[PDB]
Amino acid sequence: ADGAKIYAQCAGCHQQNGQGIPGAFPPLAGHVAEILAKEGGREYLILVLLYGLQGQIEVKGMKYNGVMSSFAQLKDEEIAAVLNHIATAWGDAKKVKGFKPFTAEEVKKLRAKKLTPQQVLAERKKLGLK
Numbered sequence: 001a002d003g004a005k006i007y008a009q010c011a012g013c014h015q016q017n018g019q020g021i022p023g024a025f026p027p028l029a030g031h032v033a034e035i036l037a038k039e040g041g042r043e044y045l046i047l048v049l050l051y052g053l054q055g056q057i058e059v060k061g062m063k064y065n066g067v068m069s070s071f072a073q074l075k076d077e078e079i080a081a082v083l084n085h086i087a088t089a090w091g092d093a094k095k096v097k098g099f100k101p102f103t104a105e106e107v108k109k110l111r112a113k114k115l116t117p118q119q120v121l122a123e124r125k126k127l128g129l130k
Helices: 003-008 032-036 041-051 076-088 104-111 117-126
Strands: 057-059 062-064
Touching (some): 003 076, 032 076, 041 076, 041 104, 041 117, 076 104
Antiparallel strands (some): 057 062
C-alpha cells in the first residue's frame, strides 16, 4: 500500500502537512515521535486507526476534546502504510531510537480484540499522556 496516497485521502482534519488545526485537530507532525517514545505507543497508534478516539487530551500544551472515527475499513497493510507515512513524512521517526516500520501482522493482532473509542482513550492514559 502507498501510505502517502491513503493519507491524502483522509487528511482533511490533520492537514496534508500534518500540523493540524489548533484546538480542533491535533498535530501529527512532531507529535507522533512523542507517542512512539512511550512504551506501548506503537500499539496505541494502531488502536486509534482501528477503533477511533474520544475524550479530553492534551497535545503540545493545548487541550482537545473531539472525536475521531474508526478507519477499520482499511486493510492491515493499509493501516501499516499510513502509520509509516505519519511516522516519517515530517521526520518523527528520526527522533526515536530503534524504530522499525509498522507491519501488517501488528495490525492483524490488534484487530482481533475490538475496542471502543472510550477504551482507546484509556489506553492513551496508560502511556502516561495527559
